[model samples]
Target: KQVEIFTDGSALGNPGPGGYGAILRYRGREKTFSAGYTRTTNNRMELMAAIVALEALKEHAEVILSTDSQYVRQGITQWIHNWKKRGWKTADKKPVKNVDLWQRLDAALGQHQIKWEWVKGHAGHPENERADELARAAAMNPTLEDTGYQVE
Candidate 1:
């Protein structure tokens, strides 16, 4: 059976507090995970949500991952290939932002069959709305430091 996953991320001030939330549903059961960071970007949080959800799987599984972040959806499904071929640099030869999270996301993708879907945010999708709520609540009360977050 395929697992249906929904994820969302939030940041208070782009580089302020941030958080991610994800829900994984399979065989009529659902599991959710969420956490906050003292400082991070929305893109990082978005990547983290997908990473955390996929990494939680105990075995290889087919996944339909829905997210509100085109950066997450398109980067993994499209941009990453070029980024890798270019030695993780952009077209202008600049280092990719959030390389740490991007690498971690790539690693977490190993061996899973995943379909990425982009959803319009806050459009009344139940699970996405729930995920957004979770992320925003966590961002309001961040407890952990984002060690990989660089001071830029």
Candidate 2:
């Protein structure tokens, strides 16, 4: 059977403390988990949520990953190809932001057959809302530093 995953991310001030949450469901069991960071962006956490959830699988899987962030969904499903073709540069010839996490995410995605899904945030989708709550709670208590985040 395939796995169903719901994910979300939060940040106190756009680039302030941040966190990610994910719920993985399979068969009759489901597990939810999250992580917080001392400093990061919401987009980063969104990407991280997907990465963490996908990497949690012990073997190759058929997965349906849902997220509220269009950044995560579109980046992986569409934008990434253009970025890679241009050596990770954007259409404007600028270097891509969050290359580190994007690279790691690409690797995490290597073994899974994933269906990227989008859900509107704070719009009454139950699982998406729960994921949002978990992410927000974690953001309130971030413990780890996001080593890859570069402050400008």
Candidate 3:
């Protein structure tokens, strides 16, 4: 069976409280997940959402991940292997911005045959809409628990 996953992230202020959201659907089962962070970047939140979503899947499942961030999709599908071969640094010799999330995502990815697809954000895709709703809501809620910085 294949699982279809959608993910999104939002931040009120780039380095301020932020949140990530994901939706998973498979075999008539549906699950929604979200998390907020006290201080982080939108990109980190985006990648974190995908990482968390992939982590929630069982090993050996076929997976298709749909996301809005080209950074996340391109990084995982096109650049990650080269980044790993280069010792986790970008082509410019700068360290990858979100190595921890990338590492976790890499491991989670190893568990399945995964495909990454990019969808325009705020478009009419149902799961994407749901994820965006959850993300923005979490970002606006003052009482939402913080996940903290996944990076330094």
Candidate 4:
């Protein structure tokens, strides 16, 4: 069986309050995941959205992840092997950004088959549109709780 996943991330002020959202559909069932950060970058939130979606799946499930961030899509689809070979560091020898989330995502991914698909943000894809709505809504709602991963 195969699962379809859509994910998106949003930030109010780049390094300010941010949120990530994802929608997963499989076997006629659907789930939504969203989280807000006190302070974080848009890129980290983007990757986290995909990570969270995949993590929600059962072990050994097949996934086709649709996302808007090239960083997330490219990192998992193309650059992960090279990054691992370089000891998790980037070409400049600097620690990879959002290393913690990346490591968790890497480990979670080990148990599943994933295909990364890049989708244009706000382009009107159903799931992508829903995920984008969730992300933006979370970013605007102050009463929503923060994920501990927030940078502060």
lDDT by residue (2-32, candidate 3, tens digit) is 8999999878876777888999999989999
Cα error of candidate 4 at position 40, Å: 0.9
The 10 consecutive residues of candidate 1 with the worst lDDT sum are 116-125
Off by over 4 Å in 4: 142-152
Please report how far candidate 3 places residue 130 from its true position, in Å.
Answer: 0.9
lDDT of 4 at 73: 74
Across 1-152, the per-residue lDDT of candidate 1 in tens digits comes to 99999999889986899999999999999999999998998888989999999999898999999998988977877888988999999878878888888999899887799888888857768999999899999999999899998866
Q: Judge candidate 4 against the unseen true structure and give its global Cα lDDT, from 0 to 1.
A: 0.80
All candidates: CA RMSD (Å): 1.4, 1.6, 2.5, 2.6
Relative to the true structure, how large is the alpha-carbon lDDT of every model? 0.89, 0.89, 0.82, 0.80
Count of residue pairs whose backbone atoms collide, per candidate: 0, 0, 0, 0
**How does model 1 score by TM-score?**
0.93
Q: Distance (Å) between predicted and true CA of 116, model 1?
A: 1.3
In angstroms, the error of model 1 at 78 is 3.3
Candidate number of the best lDDT: 1
Compute the lDDT for candidate 1.
Answer: 0.89
- For each candidate in turn, the TM-score is 0.93, 0.93, 0.87, 0.87
Stretches of candidate 2 off by over 4 Å are: 91-94, 122-124
* Candidate 1, residue 5: lDDT: 93
